[PDB]
Amino acid sequence: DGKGRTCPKPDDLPFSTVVPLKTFYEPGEEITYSCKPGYVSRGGMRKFICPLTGLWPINTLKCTPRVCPFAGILENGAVRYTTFEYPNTISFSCNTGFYLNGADSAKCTEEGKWSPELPVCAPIICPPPSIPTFATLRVYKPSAGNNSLYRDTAVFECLPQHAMFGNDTITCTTHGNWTKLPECREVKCPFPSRPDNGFVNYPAKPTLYYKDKATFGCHDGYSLDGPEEIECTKLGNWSAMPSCKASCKVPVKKATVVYQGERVKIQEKFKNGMLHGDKVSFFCKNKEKKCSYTEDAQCIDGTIEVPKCFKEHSKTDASDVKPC
C-alpha cells in the first residue's frame, strides 16, 4: 500500500484491441493498443507502461475504417452505395443497351481495396444474323462495325412464290442473340372453280402459288356472296370461294320499308330488283292497339318472303301509322 498500486483494466476504445488484456497490472508491465483489422489510426499502435501511480496515461488513439478508392462513377451505369469505407459492399448495374462486364458487387476488404475488382459496362452487341433458307434480307444496317447493337433489327422477305412463317423482323436482344427467325416455304394452291351463273379469272400458267390473285364476276341476274378478289393463302387454300347468287324481283309493286335503318320506297330503292342478301323491314299494323311494327325479309338466291302480316293497298300504309 502507498507504493503497492496497480493499473486497472485498460479502457476499451472504438475498434481497438489491447494486449495483454488483464484486470489489473503491476507497474512496469506493458500494454499495446492496435486498431482492429480494417481500421487505422493517427499514429497507430500505442504502447503504455503501467506507471507507479497506477494511472494509465491519456490515449491519443482514434481508430477509423480504411477507405477503398472512390468507386461512385460507373461509366454507362450506376453504383448503389453508402460509403467507400470498410467493410461496406457496393453494387453495380448498367444503363440500357449495356451489359455488366465483371461482378455485380464488391466489398471493401480489411486490406483496404475492392474485392472483386470493380466491373465495367460494355455495349451489348449481336453478331451478323443468319439468312433463313429461301429468303433475302433488305433491312440491315450494322451500327457497330459488322455487328448490330441492341434493338437494331433486320427484316427478311421470302423469294417469289414462298410464304413466310413467323414475324418478318428480328431484333438484337439484351443477351446479344437475335429473336426468333422466320421460315420461308413454297406454297401451292389448286385452280379455283368458275362459279355457276358467273366467271373467274387468273393468269395463264401451269400452277398457282402464294399471293396469286383470282377475280370473280357474275351475270346480269346475279351478284357475288363474297369478295370480287381472292388470293392464294399461306396454308395452300384461297381467301374465299365466292358464289354468284340470284337477285330477287321486287316482291311488291309499292311499299315503304326500312333499308339499313332508313325509310325508303322499295320501288325506288330496288327498281331493278334486290341483290342477294339485301335485307329490308316491312311495316305491319297491330290491329288491336292501332299502331305499327316491322318484320324483316331478305333476298336469298332469288327469293324473298314478304312477311305474313303485310298487306298491299292501292285507312293507311302501316308505314304512316305511329310506332308501337
Ligand X SMILES: *[C@@H]1O[C@H](CO)[C@@H](O[C@@H]2O[C@H](CO)[C@@H](O[C@@H]3O[C@H](CO)[C@@H](O)[C@H](O)[C@@H]3O)[C@H](O)[C@H]2NC(C)=O)[C@H](O)[C@H]1NC(C)=O
Contact of residue 43 among ligand NAG, ligand X, none (CB under 5-8 Å per partner type): none
Question: Taking CB under 6 A as the rule, does residue 157 contact ligand NAG?
Answer: no
Assess contact for 86 and 108: CB atoms under 8 A. yes
Binding mask 112-151 for ligand NAG (x = CB under 6 A): ---------------------------------xx-----
Binding piece for ligand X, criterion CB under 6 A, among 73-81, 185-193, 231-239, 290-298: 231-239
Q: Take residue 11 and report the three cell numbers written for it.
A: 479502457
Contact of residue 146 among ligand NAG, ligand X, none (CB under 5-8 Å per partner type): ligand NAG
Tell which one of 3, 180, 271, 322 touches ligand X (CB under 6 A): 180
Instruction: State the number of CA atoms in the 13 A half-sphere of 264 facing the CB.
Output: 14
Question: Taking CB under 6 A as the rule, does residue 237 contact ligand X?
Answer: yes
Question: Taking CB under 6 A as the rule, does residue 183 contact ligand NAG?
Answer: no
Question: Taking CB under 6 A as the rule, does residue 175 contact ligand X?
Answer: yes
Shortest distance, position 177 Cβ to ligand X, whole Å: 4
114 or 178, CB closer to ligand X?
A: 178
Binding piece for ligand X, criterion CB under 6 A, among 32-40, 175-183, 258-266, 287-295: 175-183
Tell which one of 60, 83, 136, 167 touches ligand NAG (CB under 6 A): 167
Sign of CA dihedral 250, 256, 258, 260: positive
Shortest distance, position 99 Cβ to ligand X, whole Å: 12
Helix or strand or coil: residue 322? coil
168 or 295, CB closer to ligand NAG?
A: 168
Distance CA 126, CA 128 (A): 7
Contact of residue 169 among ligand X, ligand NAG, none (CB under 5-8 Å per partner type): ligand NAG
Instruction: State the number of CA atoms in the 13 A half-sphere of 43 facing the CB.
Output: 9
Binding piece for ligand NAG, criterion CB under 6 A, among 56-64, 162-170, 203-211, 217-225: 162-170
Assess contact for 81 and 90: CB atoms under 8 A. yes
The identity of residue 285, as a single letter, is K
Shortest distance, position 297 Cβ to ligand NAG, whole Å: 43
DSSP-H helix ranges across 155-281? 266-269
Question: Taking CB under 6 A as the rule, does residue 130 contact ligand X?
Answer: no
Helix or strand or coil: residue 267? helix
Tell which one of 21, 159, 235, 324 touches ligand X (CB under 6 A): 235
Give the long-range contacts of residues 125-132, CB within 8 A, separation 24 or more: 125/149, 125/150, 125/172, 125/176, 126/150, 126/152, 126/172, 126/173, 126/176, 126/177, 126/178, 127/176, 129/154, 129/170, 129/178, 129/181, 130/181, 131/156, 132/156, 132/181, 132/182, 132/183, 132/184
Partners of 209 in the β-ladder: 188
Question: Taking CB under 6 A as the rule, does residue 45 contact ligand X?
Answer: no
DSSP state of 320: G
CA distances from 61 to 11, 13, 33, 43, 322 (A): 11, 8, 8, 7, 107
Positions touching ligand X (CB under 6 A) are 175, 177, 179-180, 235, 237, 239-240
Positions touching ligand NAG (CB under 6 A) are 145-146, 167-169
